[PDB]
């Protein structure tokens, strides 16, 4: 479908694994907000100022209808499970790297299905929790997902970074490498 | 690998020329298989998959559901576009463009929206031979970045130039490399 | 406020 702007006013997700779910609004491929279903809390991702408001109850009851329909469809398919795809990982910086100028490392994991994955960063082969953040599962036209993880790092000549993703389609924790070419 | 049964629902709105041509497609998906679809240009539910046949046949029988979905293109799509017209569609951030070799690369980073055309110049004449360009990289934080490389034969060359144009730029950006 | 699309329940 061709259009000037495409929005997903309700990417609703519910899976039996956790069990877990996800509710986000997307406009032109980017995430406007998500709803923390466990905390019953709307978390906005707009890069602007806005007085907008969205009641998190809509997500909770919408996902409830998804759970209702999922159980009945797991039954009507003689239990057909989701087949695990192989994620495609790519690491790159947000800005050109300058020594000593704080930057952001981006780890794009694409073609995710089912929507379940651990994404962690390693620095010099050791784990790092400070300065890491990620997006929700963003939707794709083939109904898979992609996730993007961010690592705020200070470029130096001694720090080495890897992106470690783990998915059932992998059968081996993938590590994508990146070095600061100044 | 433990078994997982997913379910997806996507109320996708398509806008062309402001709100002239607006189209809603609500997709109900079992795993990665869209089973039922409400196409606003069709007017009613249409099963895409055997699984969706009993779901579509039922929803189509309920008059109240049909009236809600036929009006969702206005109640949801066109309504949200009005507040989209005041927020994200106003977002214009200028790209930061630098030049460095590895082959000459022009790094255009952190710009919104996505529509961007960049050109390479050699000495004033647009070098178009061997200008491999990269896809549009979505950073996921409401910014984009794009890299453009050029097969440069630099011997006795003088001043390469990267020239980018963007909806946030009143006058286009020009950065050179002597 | 942003409105959102609603998924319909199927017959059990």
């Amino acid at each position: 479908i061709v259009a000037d702007h495409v929005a997903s006013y309700g990417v609703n997700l519910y899976q039996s694994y956790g069990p877990s779910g996800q509710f986000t609004h997307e406009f032109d491929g980017d995430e406007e907000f998500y709803v923390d279903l466990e905390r019953k809390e709307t978390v906005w991702k707009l890069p602007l100022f806005h007085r907008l408001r969205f009641d998190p109850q809509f997500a909770l009851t919408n996902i409830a209808v998804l759970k209702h329909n999922l159980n009945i469809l797991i039954k009507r398919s003689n239990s057909t499970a989701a087949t695990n795809e192989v994620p495609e990982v790519t690491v790159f910086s947000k800005s050109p790297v300058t020594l000593g100028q704080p930057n952001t490392l981006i780890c794009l994991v694409d073609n995710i299905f089912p929507p379940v994955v651990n994404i962690t960063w390693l620095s010099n082969g050791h784990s790092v929790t400070e300065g890491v953040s990620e997006t929700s599962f963003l939707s794709k036209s083939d109904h898979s997902f992609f996730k993007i993880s961010y690592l705020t790092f200070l470029p130096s000549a001694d720090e080495i970074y890897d992106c470690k993703v783990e998915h059932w389609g992998l059968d081996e924790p993938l590590l994508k490498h990146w070095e600061p070419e100044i | 690998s433990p078994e997982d049964f997913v379910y997806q629902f996507k109320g996708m709105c398509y806008f062309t020329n402001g709100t002239e041509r607006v189209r809603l497609v609500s997709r109900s998906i079992y795993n990665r298989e869209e089973i039922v679809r409400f196409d606003s240009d069709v007017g009613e539910f249409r099963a895409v998959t055997l699984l969706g046949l009993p779901a579509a046949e039922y929803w189509n029988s309920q008059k109240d559901i049909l009236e809600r979905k036929r009006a969702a293109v206005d109640r949801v799509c066109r309504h949200n576009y009005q507040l989209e017209l005041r927020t994200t569609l106003q977002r214009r951030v200028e790209p930061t463009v630098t030049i460095s070799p590895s082959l000459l690369v022009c790094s255009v980073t952190d710009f919104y929206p996505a529509q961007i055309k960049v050109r390479w110049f050699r000495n004033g004449q647009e070098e178009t031979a061997g200008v491999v360009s990269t896809p549009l990289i979505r950073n996921g934080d409401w910014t984009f970045q794009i890299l453009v490389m050029l097969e440069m034969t630099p011997q006795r060359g003088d001043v390469y130039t990267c020239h980018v144009e963007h909806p946030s730029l009143q006058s286009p950006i020009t950065v050179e490399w002597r | 406020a942003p409105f959102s699309e609603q998924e319909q329940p199927v017959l059990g």
Partner: antibody, heavy 107, light 111 residues
Framework: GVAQSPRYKIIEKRQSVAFWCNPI?????LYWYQQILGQGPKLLIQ??????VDDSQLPKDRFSAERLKGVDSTLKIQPAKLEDSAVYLC??????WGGGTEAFFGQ | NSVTQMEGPVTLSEEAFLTINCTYT??????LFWYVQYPGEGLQLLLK?????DKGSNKGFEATYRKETTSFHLEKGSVQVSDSAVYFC???????????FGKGTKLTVNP
């Protein structure tokens, strides 16, 4: 349709009452209204499933409601004010999940 | 609130033409309702229009959702004595679509 209980209730001036309501099976939204004598229904509270969505017009000094499991609801008033003499309506609606937003009222 | 009704009681003869004005204000694309409350009964839904130019009709009552005038006037060609009731104009408002009712219009049809 929606079931309400009781149909009539007499209570003393400084006393407590509890109104029970069972919505149409599967309806998300549930309202409690107040209709005083010859007037229109004044909205008190609206439930989504089990979560309160609107309670701007609910006098928390004595009025309180709950819909724990997201099906039946109970509205309580304590203490009572002689101004509370009215008909307390309960209504339910699919809220867009399974049907329209129209509300179906009880007795 | 956001729905203004024909304030005041109405009295008509056994075959007169009934017209109850109702206008809305809210931005966006709301649904419009008409609820009837017969004397000694609960509130029934009379008719409703979900979107633009849709006309709800029931029991000989008609109401056209008119965007050009932000109106939804209730009409009936030949009223009847059994039509004596209170008629409420309603439109759901807010992000959650809460059904809020107007003041209502009392109608007594004399024979």
């Amino acid at each position: 349709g929606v079931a309400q209980s009781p149909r009539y209730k007499i209570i003393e001036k400084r006393q407590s009452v509890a109104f029970w309501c069972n919505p149409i099976s599967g309806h998300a939204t549930l309202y409690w209204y107040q209709q005083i004598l010859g007037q229109g229904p004044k909205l008190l509270i609206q439930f989504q499933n089990n979560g309160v969505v609107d309670d701007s017009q609910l006098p928390k000094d004595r009025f309180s409601a709950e819909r724990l499991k997201g099906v039946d609801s109970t509205l309580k008033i304590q203490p009572a004010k002689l101004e509370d003499s009215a008909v307390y309506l309960c209504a339910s609606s699919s809220g867009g999940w399974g049907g329209g937003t129209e509300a179906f009222f009880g007795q | 609130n956001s729905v203004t009704q024909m304030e005041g009681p109405v009295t008509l003869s056994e075959e007169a033409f009934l017209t109850i004005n109702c206008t809305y204000t809210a931005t966006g694309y709301p649904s419009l309702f008409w609820y009837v409350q017969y004397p000694g009964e609960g509130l029934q839904l009379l008719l409703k229009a979900t979107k633009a130019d849709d006309k709800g009709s029931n029991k000989g009552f008609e109401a056209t959702y008119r965007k050009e005038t932000t109106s939804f006037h209730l009409e009936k060609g030949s009223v009847q004595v059994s039509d004596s009731a209170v008629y409420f104009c309603a439109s759901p408002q807010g992000g959650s679509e809460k059904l809020v009712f107007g003041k209502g219009t009392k109608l007594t049809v004399n024979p």
